[PDB]
Design a protein around this ligand. Structure first.
Ligand code: ZA9
Lengths: 178, 242
């Protein structure tokens, strides 16, 4: 087994902590959802290759520009997260998170991940967004942003239902191996 | 960690740690507040445990088995004794507050009604000054500690055999040298997330809501000061580069 490091980046409410918790526990916690994620070393087997994938979150570091880059050393794959119920979190990707990740992690593959995909079919979500002349992020808007920033690929998931979660981490492991 | 504290914090939540007959007697709003307070203590217990692996397992093991020059061991684990002192003391107060709150005849049923006062004490005065000075020093030495580690593992056979031996148990899977250093750096930015969520479920008593609001402002002031006092040191950096 080879050791690879994964770091998840994105705005405060992009759902990155929930994504890491759901994958590491291998289910959506029923009794209590933790506020924070410390670290985790996942045992993954993708395309016949065994990898130890260390998982890290940057939640809480969004306002601290000198503390945050300390999470970046020796990263092998970056998951760049946005929330599908938050079109404003998508516009922060190209001129805030992308220049930072390319400066501290040159040549590291970035996977753009659209979280909370279940909220695309939520009535309360659609009503609250329509009040600000907005709508949930469309699949083509996510793909176009991933293409524009030079992402390795574009993927969607739902930590709430676990749909697409396992696929995101298996693809991140494949990206870290290249 | 010690068995007593591990069992007290083994459950995934406060609602699973307490007896179900004690859980039934409480309002859901109290259960929610207690679940987040329990997460704060449980993660503080794990943070102190991370610091003990760095001082007792790694640092002291290197000094006693490898007879490595102490200036090298210092470069690998900057401020570990000072950090261990600050967090072991904070943990002792959190654990004592829980112990005092236990029902007679019980080692697990408790409700912590007051926390803000302890959080204001930890994040103000001399103790806050010591955390600010220590984390500014630690985080400025973080990158150099990682490069020194990578040099020694790649070029020294006895150091590589030492690391492989002490990190072999499954309980150390996420606690290698680099993992411990980043776990420590990330600890300080977890405090506002935990305290804000405790505050969200602490409006029942106005003085407690006020104390948690003050504690939150103090942790953010501390974080902003630590962030401003950081400049990454480079091993063998020239004056012209600084
Ligand atoms: C975030 C971003 C940066 C640079 C400057 C702007 C472009 N992206 C990389 C730095 C430099 C030091 N700390 C930083 C935090």
């Amino acid at each position: 087994a080879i050791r690879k490091k994964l770091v998840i980046v994105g705005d405060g409410a992009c759902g990155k902590t929930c994504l890491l918790i759901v994958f590491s526990k291998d289910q959506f916690p029923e009794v209590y959802v933790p506020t924070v994620f410390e670290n985790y070393v996942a045992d993954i087997e993708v395309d016949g290759k065994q990898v130890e994938l260390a998982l890290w979150d940057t939640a809480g570091q969004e306002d601290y520009d000198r503390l945050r880059p300390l999470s970046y050393p020796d990263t092998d794959v970056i998951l760049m997260c946005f929330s599908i119920d938050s079109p404003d979190s998508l516009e922060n990707i190209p001129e805030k998170w992308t220049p930072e990740v390319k400066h501290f992690c040159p040549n590291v593959p970035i996977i753009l991940v659209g979280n909370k995909k279940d909220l695309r079919n939520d009535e309360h979500t659609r009503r609250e967004l329509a009040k600000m002349k907005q709508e949930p992020v469309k699949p083509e808007e996510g793909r176009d942003m991933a293409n524009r920033i030079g992402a390795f690929g574009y993927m969607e998931c739902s930590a709430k239902t676990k749909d697409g979660v396992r696929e995101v981490f298996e693809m991140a492991t494949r990206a870290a191996l290249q | 960690s010690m068995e007593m504290d591990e069992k007290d914090f083994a459950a995934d939540s406060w609602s699973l740690a307490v007896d179900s007959s004690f859980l039934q007697q409480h309002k859901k709003e109290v259960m929610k507040q207690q679940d987040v307070i329990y997460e704060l203590i449980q993660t503080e217990l794990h943070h102190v445990r991370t610091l003990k692996i760095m001082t007792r397992l790694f640092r002291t093991g290197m000094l006693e088995e490898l007879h490595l020059e102490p200036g090298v061991v210092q470069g690998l684990f900057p401020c570990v004794d000072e950090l261990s002192d600050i967090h072991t003391r904070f943990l002792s107060q959190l654990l004592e507050r829980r112990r005092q709150a236990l029902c007679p005849g019980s080692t697990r049923n408790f409700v912590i009604h007051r926390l803000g006062d302890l959080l204001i004490s930890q994040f103000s005065g001399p103790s806050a000054e010591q955390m600010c000075k220590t984390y500014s020093e630690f985080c400025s030495r973080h990158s150099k500690a990682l490069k020194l580690y990578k040099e020694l593992y790649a070029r020294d056979k006895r150091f590589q055999q030492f690391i492989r031996k002490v990190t072999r148990p499954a309980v150390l899977k996420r606690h290698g040298v680099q993992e411990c250093i980043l776990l420590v750096t990330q600890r300080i930015t977890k405090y506002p997330l935990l305290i804000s969520r405790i505050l969200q479920h602490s409006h029942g008593i106005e003085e407690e809501r006020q104390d948690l609001t003050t504690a939150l402002g103090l942790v953010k002031e501390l974080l902003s000061n630590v962030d401003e006092g950081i400049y990454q040191l480079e091993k063998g950096a020239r004056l012209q580069e600084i």
